Design an enzyme around this catalytic site. Structure first.
Site, PDB file in Angstrom:
ATOM      1  N   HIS A   1       0.838  -1.196   0.000  1.00  0.00           N
ATOM      2  CA  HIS A   1       0.000   0.000   0.000  1.00  0.00           C
ATOM      3  C   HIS A   1       0.878   1.253   0.000  1.00  0.00           C
ATOM      4  O   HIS A   1       1.935   1.255   0.592  1.00  0.00           O
ATOM      5  CB  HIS A   1      -0.875  -0.045   1.250  1.00  0.00           C
ATOM      6  CG  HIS A   1      -1.901   1.044   1.325  1.00  0.00           C
ATOM      7  ND1 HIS A   1      -2.851   1.249   0.345  1.00  0.00           N
ATOM      8  CD2 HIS A   1      -2.149   1.961   2.285  1.00  0.00           C
ATOM      9  CE1 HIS A   1      -3.621   2.259   0.692  1.00  0.00           C
ATOM     10  NE2 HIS A   1      -3.209   2.718   1.859  1.00  0.00           N
TER      11      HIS A   1
ATOM     12  N   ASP B   1      -4.175   8.939   3.336  1.00  0.00           N
ATOM     13  CA  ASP B   1      -4.301   7.473   3.179  1.00  0.00           C
ATOM     14  C   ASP B   1      -5.644   7.144   2.557  1.00  0.00           C
ATOM     15  O   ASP B   1      -6.694   7.310   3.209  1.00  0.00           O
ATOM     16  CB  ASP B   1      -4.157   6.763   4.555  1.00  0.00           C
ATOM     17  CG  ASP B   1      -4.225   5.220   4.463  1.00  0.00           C
ATOM     18  OD1 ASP B   1      -4.504   4.641   3.383  1.00  0.00           O
ATOM     19  OD2 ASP B   1      -4.013   4.577   5.498  1.00  0.00           O
TER      20      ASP B   1
ATOM     21  N   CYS C   1      -4.030   2.726  -4.749  1.00  0.00           N
ATOM     22  CA  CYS C   1      -3.554   3.700  -3.759  1.00  0.00           C
ATOM     23  C   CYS C   1      -2.581   4.700  -4.330  1.00  0.00           C
ATOM     24  O   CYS C   1      -2.630   5.881  -3.980  1.00  0.00           O
ATOM     25  CB  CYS C   1      -2.926   3.022  -2.545  1.00  0.00           C
ATOM     26  SG  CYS C   1      -1.911   1.594  -2.897  1.00  0.00           S
TER      27      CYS C   1
END
EC number: 3.4.22.-
Length: 240
Positions: A115, A132, A184
């Protein structure tokens, strides 16, 4: 996905530099993780501060291997926005494991549980912003706020004007990546682009609630940004 690999994130940070002329491209030969990101953010801003008072030596010391020292000094001179991307995999509990798993995913492509998150340091607004796309993949948002608040004290002193800490913003006010998407990287780039456009934006207003509409936003962001990045020299640092 195109924007999930470190090189393409480098190329995106180059593009933001050529569009906006105030962004320090990131240094992928120095991979950051939760183990070393705070230290490296600090080293970078002390180098920036030293360039401000005509000290070139610490700079030669921290120069990215694919960039000339003088060009690095010049880019630090004019940068006010410092993006840093942290890579993370909750399996790894050492830095050598973390980096071994990172090299594997970049070499093969297989995402797994890896990630990316984003930290932006902005010296024009004396602010540190965290993003995030999953909100709490690495840590709880208050744990991340705490770590970052401590970095903000460090930065306020490292980079004066007097030595007051920087502000800390959590930009991921709500989740933007649903559970089965490997996006991401792209979300970090799109957050940065919005930040450069207007550093006071709200993420909730940019992103639709409907899952198709959201996916479509990003897909458009990705195509267009992929097209602008095609016609480039490979992995060259920009100039001033």
């Amino acid at each position: 996905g195109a924007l999930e690999d470190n090189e393409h994130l480098f190329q995106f940070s180059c593009l933001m530099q050529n569009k906006h002329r105030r962004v320090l491209p990131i240094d992928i030969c120095n991979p950051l993780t939760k183990f070393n990101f705070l230290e490296c953010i600090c080293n970078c801003l002390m180098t920036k501060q030293s360039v401000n008072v005509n000290e070139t030596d610490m700079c030669e010391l921290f120069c990215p291997p694919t960039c000339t020292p003088e060009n690095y000094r010049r880019l630090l001179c004019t940068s006010s926005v410092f993006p840093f991307v942290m890579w993370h995999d909750p399996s790894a509990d050492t830095q050598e494991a973390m980096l071994t798993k990172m090299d594997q995913t970049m070499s093969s492509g297989r995402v797994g549980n890896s990630h990316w998150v984003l930290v932006i340091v902005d010296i024009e607004y004396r602010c540190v912003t965290f993003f995030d796309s999953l909100c709490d993949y690495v840590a709880s948002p208050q744990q991340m706020r705490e770590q970052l608040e401590g970095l903000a004290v460090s930065l306020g002193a490292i980079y004066p004007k007097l030595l007051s800490p920087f502000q800390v913003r959590i930009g991921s006010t709500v989740k933007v990546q649903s559970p089965g998407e490997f996006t991401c990287g792209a979300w970090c780039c799109q957050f940065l682009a919005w930040y450069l456009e207007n550093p006071d934006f709200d993420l909730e207003e940019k992103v639709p609630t409907n899952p198709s509409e959201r996916r479509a936003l990003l897909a458009d962001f990705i195509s267009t940004t992929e097209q602008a990045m095609s016609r480039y020299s490979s992995l060259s640092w920009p100039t001033t």
